[PDB]
Amino acid sequence: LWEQFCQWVTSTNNRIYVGWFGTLMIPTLLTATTCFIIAFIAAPPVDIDGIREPVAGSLLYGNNIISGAVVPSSNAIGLHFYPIWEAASLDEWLYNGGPYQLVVFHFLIGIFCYMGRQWELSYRLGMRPWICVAYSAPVSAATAVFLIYPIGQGSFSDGMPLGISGTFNFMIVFQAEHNILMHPFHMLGVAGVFGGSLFSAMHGSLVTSSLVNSRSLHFFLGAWPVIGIWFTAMGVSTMAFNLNGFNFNQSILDSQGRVIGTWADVLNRANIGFEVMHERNAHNFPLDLA
Amino acid sequence: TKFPKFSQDLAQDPTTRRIWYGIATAHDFETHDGMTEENLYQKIFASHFGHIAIIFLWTSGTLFHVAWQGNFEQWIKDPLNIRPIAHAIWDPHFGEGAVNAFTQAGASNPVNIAYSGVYHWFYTIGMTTNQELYSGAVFLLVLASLFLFAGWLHLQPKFRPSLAWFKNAESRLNHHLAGLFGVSSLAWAGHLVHVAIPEARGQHVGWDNFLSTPPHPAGLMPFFTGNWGVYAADPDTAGHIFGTSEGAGTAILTFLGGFHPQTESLWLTDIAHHHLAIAVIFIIAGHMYRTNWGIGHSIKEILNAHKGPLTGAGHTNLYDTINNSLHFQLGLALASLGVITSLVAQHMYSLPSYAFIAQDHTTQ
Amino acid sequence: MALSDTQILAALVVALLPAFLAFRLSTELYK
Amino acid sequence: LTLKIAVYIVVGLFISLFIFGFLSSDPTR
Amino acid sequence: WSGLLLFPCAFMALGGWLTGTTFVTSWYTHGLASSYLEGANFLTVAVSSPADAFGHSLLFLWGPEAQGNLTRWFQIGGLWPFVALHGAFGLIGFMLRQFEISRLVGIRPYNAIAFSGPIAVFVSVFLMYPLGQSSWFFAPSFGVAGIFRFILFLQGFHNWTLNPFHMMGVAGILGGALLCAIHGATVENTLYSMVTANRFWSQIFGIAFSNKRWLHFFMLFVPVTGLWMSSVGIVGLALNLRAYDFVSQELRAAEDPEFETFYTKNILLNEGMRAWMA
Amino acid sequence: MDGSYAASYLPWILIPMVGWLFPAVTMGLLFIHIESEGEG
Amino acid sequence: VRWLAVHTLAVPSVFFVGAIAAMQFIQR
Amino acid sequence: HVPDLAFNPWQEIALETDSTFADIAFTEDPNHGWLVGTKETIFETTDGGDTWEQKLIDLGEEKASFSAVSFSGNEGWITGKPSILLHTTDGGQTWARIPLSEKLPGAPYSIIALGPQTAEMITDLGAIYKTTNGGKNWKALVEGAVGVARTIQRSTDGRYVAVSARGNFYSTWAPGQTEWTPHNRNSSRRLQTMGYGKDGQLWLLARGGQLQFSTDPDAEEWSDVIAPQDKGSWGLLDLSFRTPEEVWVAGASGNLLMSQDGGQTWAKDTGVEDIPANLYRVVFLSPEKGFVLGQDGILLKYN
Amino acid sequence: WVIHSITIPMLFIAGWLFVSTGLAYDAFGTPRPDEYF
Ligand code: CLA
Ligand code: CLA
Ligand code: CLA
Ligand code: CLA
Ligand SMILES: C=Cc1c(C)c2cc3nc(c4c5[nH]c(cc6nc(cc1[nH]2)C(C)=C6CC)c(C)c5C(=O)[C@@H]4C(=O)OC)[C@@H](CCC(=O)OC/C=C(\C)CCC[C@H](C)CCC[C@H](C)CCCC(C)C)[C@@H]3C
Ligand SMILES: CC1=C(/C=C/C(C)=C\C=C\C(C)=C/C=C/C=C(C)/C=C/C=C(C)/C=C/C2=C(C)C(=O)CCC2(C)C)C(C)(C)CCC1
Ligand SMILES: [Fe+2]
């Protein structure tokens, strides 16, 4: 029976190509999807901050699709591997944000096997395997923002929350504590994505107009956003090890040494404000109260 | 006077000797004023980064000048009859006779003739067009930039290595044996198999198509199933002409021995199996010293255990002596490097590895 | 084929970056 | 502790199938 | 025609930028060294916004502002309106040039509608938003760090991330990049040969593109759609705000220490930013 | 003093700077630095 | 017509780069 | 694996409640003590914590999470966020609710009773007040805000430290100053918690359980990074000093470790590792009277 | 070469002298480090 199974697996006549990489892609992807849906529906509140302020991102705990998310693991976990069997009880696993780790790991393995299946199918059909080269950049970015950054920061709670509001909160805190905008590699990624959109618009308009070296142009235009995403993933990975962006504050001094301050100082002030969400001292708090 | 800032004894000298000795003791970081061991090691680390970047820039310049003002594409058509060209000459002090004399090797201007034997090396490793040389030069520029930035980075307060990090012999040996030696050799073998051999057999392979061109007809099947002999079948015959498909075999790892009948040099497949085997051996060797998993040897106990009734204390306490003295390590490294360089010369004049380099006597 | 003028100019522009990085490294080492 | 063994054998057999299938396929290898 | 009017003005639009980043400062308007002349590097230099005392004044050089004095015309920060006006008119000249070139060729002017995106983005961000604001002071600066500060200011004062229009713009930009990369890979991997690529995509993803027409059409209309949605979001920002505001969740988290949401933390960050400057 | 390589005009300006301009510039800068009596 | 189309930006460029080069020592 | 502790000097009590335990306090050794936590849950003991009885109380709003409890003499205070204060002088037999004034900046976090009719109020937003009229009147010692603080710790002699909202930096304050001094974190990893050791120095717990100790009064420099669990990446949650020499640390999944050398070597208490809870705070009122407060109504008592 | 041999070289030193002394600061109104408060 094994030979027929292998023939069916490798067959290109099937409705959907599975491939031997698919034999690992399907279980990991399905596990990630199932656990992600379960957490997005009915995840118990998770104490991500490690203080007595639990955070719940499930729909059954009073959240919408925009606000709902999958909370990262508890800050008490750190980088320690936390599978279900290593937990004292299922409730302990649920309250420590274990579903986040499970989903992230199985989904990362799934996208790696998606790469493998892409390459396997491109090699079986004889087509040139450059689609995987382009697909590397989003995969590299996902690995950097989901695995490299938590490892660099020493906690899995610092990863991107699996949601919409959590994504924006993560981006804001990343800018606050890293100054990613001043880092040249987010600049290069921004340039890459903007140029890719520009090239897309130009070529789509040209083809639509013409619709009732070219190869070198197409390949270079396609490679531009891939290179940009590679650069931005490299920048995020470097940030993960505290290699922050440019700090041009406190630079320009006057004749007597008094600091003049530039727009970099204004950006630093904005970052500090996003760092601490209130005013500073010497602001005349009430002296006495009843 | 300010210069030299690192020695107040020299800075207060009124004579011109201060200018001389300041240069002489400049890079002697040990005797500088107010020098600590940690600062010494960090400064040495940065300086070594700088020397590496300088080496990369020098190689990039060689490549760039050869590509720009050389005759590489003409030389490959006739390696035994065309003089390689080093760099162009621009001397306003020249006269007409010198201009006529130095216009050689078919050039249209005064130009030199290369004697470093790099044309043969570039031909053997695979590169055949000027664009490849230019790309290599640009990539080496980028590498030098990266290493310079690394030297700057590991000097900042947030990245300065600790003194305990520098004195970690076991981890350094493990990484620099398994990684620096073994992995680099394995990568070079992979480069020879994936690019150099097909290029020498006529099949052009580059960054554009190396992802869809298998170096062997049987890909990874014999290697993984233990049937390694498949990769040694059908070698290059004695009638093979370098760079063409006439008499070209399909084997990627052989043990032919001897020399190529045409290039009077070693077979490329022999080099492939050689560097692959030494890569495996180095990777094995790099798993010897204990770092963080309990397993592995520790150098101190090995040194202290090899005593002897005739030599007295044997090799006791040598670990501390070598680790705490940078001059001992520098002397050991210099002696080893000198012996290896002598070996390179002796085994390279008699066992040429590059095509048509034994017939260019001046370069040899 | 032989190189182009733009290739040499681009090589010069690229080599500008290691010059700046080496300047920064030398200044840092002088400290 | 039965869950750990269950998942362990699951992944073990999955990677065993993954490594065996490539050996089975004679074309393009 | 329009072929030789965009070139001069845009040049001035360019020119006043460099002299706007190397010699003219903002010590009398923003209290910052926004010029290279003080030693600010390329990232730090910019063309600062005019002082808010003049309101929505066009800051004409010959006009009542600066009374024709060029030094006054510098210190009042008229360089920002100068550059903004010159750049906007250069952009409209480029638009008209594309329209007339398409007319000359005779093809349908899809390139003009493709470039309509950046036109809308620029006329909304740098012209319309200050018009809906108090004065030119709150308008974005012409530089590197100024744009980042403007972005952070809008995040603090508008919750711009939660706006569905910036969400659509982000989706459009990312989809345009995705389609560009996939188009490059497909074109250089099939070396027409569309049918085999369709088969490959069917066996990989499940569905593919029936025609190159549809693929090119979609990659043309995704990023321009994102840009137009972002411009419409700026329009809404000038007018009454429209964001998915969840007041019920805010109320629940206000008094319940055991209920917290990423939306609630984002709100805490937004008012935290808004608090500690005036 | 002409060459057939691409951008033959570069050595016409690069060599003088490496020959006269750069040497004199660093020569004067180093001479000023070594005699700088500002500190020690 | 290319003469002015080059010179109108050539003259300010060479006017400015000299100042920018002198700039690194005036603040010192 | 880390070395395993041979002896378990901690006895586990699994209270039938899901309220995380925040703080504990006592009046006298043979007298009653109190503990406050989450979800308006308060538990009173009288035998030294061997057994507890639950006290039930409800207000108009049922969202009062108690954060601190402090007893001095027979006077007692219970503070919870959002603003709620219960003060008494009868040993807690009846509690008088103090309706906090609206002008109190931020929800209160911690309270220390400096004796009879003397208390100090700490607010999460950094504001500090002092009340000597039993809550009738307050006095602001410092008139500044530190922003949102994850954790605020009080020294033996009244000095205050506060980790920032994300651990990027910290803020210190001492009596006699009207402002809070911000200081950059002294660890490469972002801060998780910081406290004052009984020796008078500071200790910082970063992400991934990177414990670091401080020396000298300024304590700008710090000791080498110490990981009590070595290869283990479990993030610790609290540090406690039974004696100025012996130290304890509490983390996740009952990972309670102890150092007999003040941090150089650490042993894992596998006796409490089976606990299905996340230990939060180890409080050593006396070297023999110590309590470990975790989660889901799980407590550890010293012996 | 004749028309370009004079136009380019002079302007570099012209700008050097223009910015080396109190001309640019007064021309564009950017305060000198002295005028800064
Ligand atoms: C003009 C504004 C602007 C623009 C254009 C960008 C652009 C970018 N920023 Mg940025 N940023 C900005 C302003 C801007 N930024 C500001 C103001 C801030 C401060 C708050 C930041 C803070 C910031 C951070 C903190 C980060 C970025 C990142 C990025 C990059 C995102 C690419 C990405 O998601 O990876 C590519 C896409 C992915 C990784 C998604 C996963 C794709 C996988 C492979 C497929 C998944 C499929 C999924 C399961 C669904 C399948 C569907 C179906 C088949 C089932 C991009 C270059 C990120 C970055 O650099 O990425 C590395 C990042 O981490 N930015
Ligand atoms: C008056 C005699 C004279 C002079 C001035 C030159 C000058 C030159 N010849 Mg030349 N030549 C001469 C006679 C002369 N030649 C004769 C008689 C022959 C035989 C016929 C040749 C054959 C010849 C050839 C074949 C070539 C030249 C080349 C060159 C040029 C090399 C470029 C250079 O020096 O920069 C580079 C500068 C250096 C390498 C400096 C080295 C010397 C210093 C002292 C070492 C540095 C020490 C120290 C670290 C310095 C610190 C820094 C310093 C600033 C303080 C240069 C223009 C080459 C050329 O045109 O290509 C560019 C070339 O290929 N010449
Ligand atoms: C895999 C990990 C790894 C790797 C790749 C390296 C690599 C390197 N380390 Mg290193 N290091 C590591 C881990 C690693 N390290 C760890 C873990 C520690 C801490 C314990 C250190 C601590 C450390 C220190 C303290 C220093 C380095 C330095 C260096 C560089 C020395 C230059 C060199 O040997 O290259 C050139 C040499 C070779 C590639 C091989 C030598 C040549 C062989 C022996 C024979 C010749 C072969 C062939 C025939 C010649 C080619 C011919 C061809 C041209 C035709 C090198 C890049 C030094 C430095 O500053 O660099 C930045 C330095 O001072 N390392
Ligand atoms: C160390 C490497 C090296 C060396 C020795 C040379 C040598 C030479 N080059 Mg050359 N070059 C190199 C790298 C190198 N090149 C690289 C990487 C590039 C690409 C940017 C060029 C681009 C280049 C051009 C465009 C021209 C030359 C020319 C020349 C000749 C005139 C002298 C000169 O260099 O000044 C002029 C050249 C330069 C100033 C180029 C910059 C040098 C590189 C980029 C930096 C090297 C720094 C070096 C490592 C410092 C070492 C420090 C040490 C002294 C302590 C001479 C034969 C000229 C020529 O052919 O005349 C006949 C010429 O027109 N070069
Ligand atoms: C990163 C943003 C971005 C930039 C900078 C940009 C720039 C450009 N795109 C152009 C084209 C296009 N853009 C297109 C689609 C797109 N373009 C996009 C995004 C961008 N496009 C996106 C997202 C799309 C997809 C919809 C198309 C379809 C075209 C074209 O047809 C055209 C082309 O062929 O490309 C080469 C060129 C217009 C030439 C012109 O008007 O001449 C006149 C130049 C003028 C008027 C100068 C502008 C003056 C500005 C407004 C003020 C001064 C600017 C300062 C120097 C810098 C200040 C900026 C600070 C941040 C520092 C120019 C190179
Ligand atoms: C990863 C990986 C996979 C796929 C790998 C693929 C698809 C490609 C891999 C390529 C790799 C791994 C390395 C390529 C390296 C190239 C290097 C390192 C070049 C260095 C050059 C130096 C240093 C010096 C250059 C020189 C030049 C330029 C000259 O012109 C003169 C000579 C010389 C001076 C030597 C898979 C997942 C399948 C399996 C697991 C491993
Ligand atoms: Fe196309």
Author numbering:
A (entry chain A): 13 to 224, 267 to 344
B (entry chain b): 3 to 366
C (entry chain m): 1 to 31
D (entry chain I): 2 to 30
E (entry chain D): 32 to 222, 244 to 330
F (entry chain i): 1 to 40
G (entry chain F): 17 to 44
H (entry chain S): 31 to 333
Please, what does the article write about this entry?
Photosystem II (PSII) is the multi-subunit membrane-bound pigment-protein complex found in oxygenic photosynthetic organisms that catalyses the light-driven oxidation of water and reduction of plastoquinone during photosynthetic electron transport. The highly conserved Ycf48 assembly factor binds to the newly synthesized D1 reaction center polypeptide and promotes the initial steps of PSII assembly, but its binding site is unclear.
In addition to the isolation of two types of RCII complex (RCII* and RCIIa), a larger 450 kDa complex consisting of the RCIIa complex bound to a monomeric PSI complex, which we term here the RCII/PSI complex, was also detected in the preparation. The preliminary processing revealed the existence of two good 3D classes out of a total of six, differing by the relative orientation of RCII to PSI. The final cryo-EM maps had a resolution of 3.2 Å and 3.1 Å for the two final classes. The overall structure obtained using the 3.1 Å map contains a monomeric PSI complex consisting of 11 subunits attached to a RCII complex consisting of the intrinsic D1 and D2 RC subunits, the low-molecular-mass PsbI subunit and the alpha (PsbE) and beta (PsbF) subunits of Cyt b-559, plus the Ycf48 accessory factor. We found that Ycf48 bound to the lumenal regions of the D1 subunit via an Arg patch consisting of six highly conserved residues (Ycf48-Arg180, Arg196, Arg215, Arg219, Arg220 and Arg237). Instead of folding back close to D1-Asp170 and D1-Glu189, as observed in the RC47 complex and the mature PSII complex, the C-terminal tail is unfolded and wrapped around the outside of the Ycf48 propeller, with H-bonds formed between Ycf48 and D1-Asn335 and the last four residues of mature D1. Examination of the interface revealed that RCII mainly interacts with PSI via hydrophobic interactions between residues D1-Phe295 and D1-Leu297 and residues PsaB-Phe161, PsaB-Leu155 and PsaB-Phe151 in the PSI PsaB RC subunit plus chlorophyll 1208, and by interactions between the C-terminus of PsbI and PsaB.
